[PDB]
Design a protein around this ligand. Sequence first.
Ligand SMILES: O=C(CSc1nc(-c2ccccc2)cc(=O)[nH]1)NO
Ligand SMILES: O=C(CSc1nc(-c2ccccc2)cc(=O)[nH]1)NO
Ligand SMILES: [Cl-]
Ligand SMILES: [Mn+2]
Ligand SMILES: [Zn+2]
Ligand SMILES: [Zn+2]
Length: 457
Amino acid sequence: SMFLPPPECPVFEPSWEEFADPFAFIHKIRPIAEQTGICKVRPPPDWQPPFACDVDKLHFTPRIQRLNELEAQTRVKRDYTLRTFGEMADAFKSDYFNMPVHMVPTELVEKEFWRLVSTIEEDVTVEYGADIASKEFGSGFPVRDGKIKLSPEEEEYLDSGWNLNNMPVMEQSVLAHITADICGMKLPWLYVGMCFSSFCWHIEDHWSYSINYLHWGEPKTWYGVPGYAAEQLENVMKKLAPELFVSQPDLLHQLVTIMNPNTLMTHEVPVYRTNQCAGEFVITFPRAYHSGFNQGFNFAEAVNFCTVDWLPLGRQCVEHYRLLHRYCVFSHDEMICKMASKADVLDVVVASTVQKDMAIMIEDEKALRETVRKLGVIDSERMDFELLPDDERQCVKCKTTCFMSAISCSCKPGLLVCLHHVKELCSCPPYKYKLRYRYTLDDLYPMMNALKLRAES
Ligand SMILES: O=C(CSc1nc(-c2ccccc2)cc(=O)[nH]1)NO
Ligand SMILES: O=C(CSc1nc(-c2ccccc2)cc(=O)[nH]1)NO
Ligand SMILES: [Cl-]
Ligand SMILES: [Mn+2]
Ligand SMILES: [Zn+2]
Ligand SMILES: [Zn+2]
């Protein structure tokens, strides 16, 4: 009546045989999980990564959070040790409820969360940790490094397919051979939670998957929306919180918010829930919106994840970013061309899928180049876009990261537009412009052919 819990998302309990290969497993469950946006995976009783840390030596700078529904927040930004954070967090929860922390029912914390965020009178603030691994606070999974002898148990999980440090560099990940600067998306993030600390509604950068593991502690409660309903959710957000939709200055500056899932469900957005317990994975699918909050003191690790299934969606995402004038994290076309340049060592299923995306890329590029030639741009020169800092190769109009080609004018030194925005660079006549291109079409067809040969093996 006050809060009606969404239906439970799918929960999978794979055998060791089914579990061992994450890419195969996710591909298998996709017909089901893509309809719910999120799903939970319980590893075989077998699989038990060791979790060891000195809570007095781990330390981090906490972020602070007000809990008001529809209030604007941002995803990116005092010091706690893991022990002193834990002490603060446990005391907060047990004081809030006047109960021992584990005797508080998960259903109650959930009901209470949605009450407190909806109430103007309440001004509850909480703290949390969120960062990539560092020397001050490393991964929860085993990683290789000298000077430290690992135990046989730790050694066992160094090369696990579900060790999140590994997933982005495995052979069926399309980011594996990517050498570009995208620290954000190949490195796991670490999240230290406390009761009610919350992650607002969002999808992943470039519509990637995310894989999320709860190492230890009280559960993390999730809400998820399938990819096919992303635009309906956004329309609801626009109607109820239009303040979130003003133009952001940077990539690091887009706005997100807390919103009751019942509100979404009332507006015909399908929503699913789950409580993720210690030792369980949650997987979010491409363009699947999700949000949630922590039941209490806990420690989670998450990583973006890009598969062959994701490739066409990645291209659509960048297109969508362009229409919104939103910054990219990386160049999709650069990733594709990098993989083509390494066709001889690519996984063959990867090669096959990349070949298909590349064919779409080349036909789109060919049409765009014909169009800008008809606008009177005649001069051209090869340009190694990958050498430019990312903030030095965005289209001045739509902020897309250029790689295949761009237009420049010596009138505006250093400025670029993508080929969709030739008319947005300056007032000079087009014959003063140069087409800057990474590859000729003659360079591109043999690259695509290499992929095709590799895929035929
Ligand atoms: O949680 C599960 C996983 S297998 C499975 N789940 C579902 C499902 C579970 C929750 C929400 C929607 C679908 C549909 C189906 O055909 N199969 N079953 O109870
Ligand atoms: O969305 C996720 C991470 S869940 C999570 N995220 C956060 C978080 C993420 C970004 C910025 C701040 C917090 C905190 C937390 O306790 N949990 N994976 O797809
Ligand atoms: Cl509040
Ligand atoms: Mn996420
Ligand atoms: Zn543009
Ligand atoms: Zn000019």
